Curated annotation (Swiss-Prot):
Tissue expression as described in the entry: Widely expressed throughout development including the anterior neuroectoderm and neural crest at stages 18 and 20, and the retina, hatching gland, otic vesicle, epibranchial placodes, pronephros and tail tip of later states. At stage 41, expressed in the liver, pancreas, branchial arches and proctodeum. Expressed broadly in adults in fat, intestine, gall bladder, eye, muscle, kidney, stomach, liver, heart, pancreas and lung.
Subcellular location per the Swiss-Prot or TrEMBL entry: Endoplasmic reticulum membrane
Species the sequence originates in: Xenopus laevis
Name of the featured protein: Malectin-A
The keyword Disulfide bond is assigned to this record: no
Lumenal side: 4-190
Parent-protein residues present: 27 to 213 of 276
Membrane topology: Single-pass type I membrane protein
UniProt keyword list: Carbohydrate metabolism, Endoplasmic reticulum, Glycoprotein, Membrane, Signal, Transmembrane, Transmembrane helix
Similarity section: Belongs to the malectin family.
GO biological process: protein N-linked glycosylation
GO cellular component, one term: endoplasmic reticulum
Domain of life of the organism encoding this protein: Eukaryota
Gene Ontology molecular functions: carbohydrate binding
Length: 190
């Protein structure tokens, strides 16, 4: 009973910062599909790397473009099973705990409404949010709230004080939460 295949189950993945990235397992981001729709890469603070990732996956877990007020993405689906939405949140020059609090939603539903990246991980590094979804017979299930699925899924984040998401590493893959592997490079395995 062996199951290995991350690149064969991905349906939609986006990193808000640079432009198009393929990570070590085979996960690919598009190119600026939320603010402006068609443009280029913007990096205002590129000499501050992430400590819990790789060099290649550091670019997909560190690069940020720009912010405004109340915004998000659209994911179109037509199949049922276990869909997992894992997104990496990161910061640059903001030191505060329990003052810079944000809101995060999936398909209109509220899940993490008090998101502070400095109080959760500490100073800099990589922050991770794991939210498993179950759609069966044409309806959606988010933890302890049941509703119906109609065409697309939405990721809508609301403002805290000055900024909204800051650094975002969106990754939605399909079939189950026991198939998502994440490790660092090591020479000895025992
Ligand atoms: O100009 C690029 C960055 O602009 C803003 O960052 C501000 C920040 O909001 C403010 O508190 C501080 O005093 O100044 C920095 C820039 O000098 C945006 O928030 C960033 O997304 C931009 O990268």
């Amino acid at each position: 009973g062996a199951m290995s295949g991350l690149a064969d189950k991905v349906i939609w993945a986006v990193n808000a910062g640079g432009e198009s990235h393929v990570d070590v397992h085979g996960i690919h981001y598009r190119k600026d599909p939320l603010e402006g729709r068609v443009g280029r890469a913007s990096d205002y603070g590129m000499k501050l790397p992430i400590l819990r990732s790789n060099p290649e996956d550091q670019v997909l877990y560190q690069t940020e473009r720009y912010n405004e007020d109340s915004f998000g993405y659209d994911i179109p689906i037509k199949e049922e099973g276990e869909y997992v939405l894992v997104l990496k949140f990161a910061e640059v020059y903001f030191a505060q705990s329990q003052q810079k609090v944000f809101d995060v939603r999936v398909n209109g539903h509220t899940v993490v409404k008090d998101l502070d990246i400095f109080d959760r991980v500490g100073h800099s590094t990589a922050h991770d949010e794991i939210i498993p979804i179950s759609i069966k017979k044409g309806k959606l299930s988010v933890q302890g709230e049941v509703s119906t699925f109609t065409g697309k899924l939405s990721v809508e984040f609301v403002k805290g004080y000055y900024d909204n998401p800051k650094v975002c590493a969106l990754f939605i893959m399909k079939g189950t939460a026991d198939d998502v592997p994440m490790l660092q490079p090591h020479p000895g395995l025992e």
